Amino acid sequence: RHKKX
Amino acid sequence: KLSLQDVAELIRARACQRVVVMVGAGISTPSGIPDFLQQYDLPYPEAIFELPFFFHNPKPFFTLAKELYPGNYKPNVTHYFLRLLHDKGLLLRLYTQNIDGLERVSGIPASKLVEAHGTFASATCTVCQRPFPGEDIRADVMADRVPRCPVCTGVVKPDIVFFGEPLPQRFLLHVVDFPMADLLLILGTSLEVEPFASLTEAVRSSVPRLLINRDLVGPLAWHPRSRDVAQLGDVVHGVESLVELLGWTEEMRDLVQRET
Ligand SMILES: [Zn+2]
Name the segment(s) of chain B with CATH classification 3.40.50.1220: 1-29+76-116+169-260
**B117 classed as catalytic:** yes
Solving technique: X-ray
Closest chain B residue to the Cα of A1, Cα to Cα: B166
Q: Residue B16 annotated as binding?
A: no
What number of CA atoms fall less than 13 Å from residue B9's CA on the CB side? 5
The torsion angles phi and psi of B94, rounded to 5 degrees, stand at -110, 110
Name the segment(s) of chain B with CATH classification 3.30.1600.10: 30-75+117-168
Resolution in A: 2.1
State how far the Cα of B29 lies from the Cα of B116, in Å rounded to an integer: 18
State how far the Cα of B123 lies from the Cα of B117, in Å rounded to an integer: 13
Q: For domain B1-29+76-116+169-260, which CATH number applies: 3.40.50.1220, 3.40.190.290, 3.30.1660.40, 3.40.50.300?
A: 3.40.50.1220
Q: Residue B164 annotated as binding?
A: no
Angle at B67 between CA B65 and CA B70, to 5 degrees: 85
What's the B124 CA to ligand 1 centre distance in angstroms? 8
Distances (CA, A) of B174 to B80, B94, B121, B137, B203: 23, 10, 22, 31, 10
CATH number of B30-75+117-168: 3.30.1600.10
- Report yes or no: B98 and B183 within 8 Å, Cβ to Cβ: no
Q: Which residues contact B237 (CB under 8 A, 6 or more apart)?
A: none
Q: Which residues contact B240 (CB under 8 A, 6 or more apart)?
A: B77
State how far the Cα of B29 lies from the Cα of B89, in Å rounded to an integer: 27
Tally C-beta pairs within 8 A across A and B.
17
Interface test with A, best of B49, B177, B194 (most A CBs within 10 A): B194
